[PDB]
């Protein structure tokens, strides 16, 4: 890749507040904030949208 840390979705997720992101298994993200708890703010690569995601639904792309 280009050097930025990326995470991948392990499962589909449907958003539960206006500030959450919906995503498919296999989606890639840049993580923007992982400091305020277990909901992380992320940017989706295929959509470009930003929002919270549940951190248990993602894993680093490296492996």
């Amino acid at each position: 890749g280009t050097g930025v840390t990326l995470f991948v979705a392990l499962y589909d997720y449907e958003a539960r507040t206006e500030d959450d992101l919906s995503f498919h298994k296999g989606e890639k993200f840049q993580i923007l904030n992982s400091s305020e708890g277990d909901w992380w703010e992320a940017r989706s690569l295929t959509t470009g949208e930003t929002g919270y995601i549940p951190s248990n639904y993602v894993a680093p792309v490296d492996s």
């Binding site: 392990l10 499962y11 549940p54 639904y57």
Partner: peptide, 8 residues
Amino acid sequence: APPIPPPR
């Protein structure tokens, strides 16, 4: 609230 569990 914590993250929800992975889907069924």
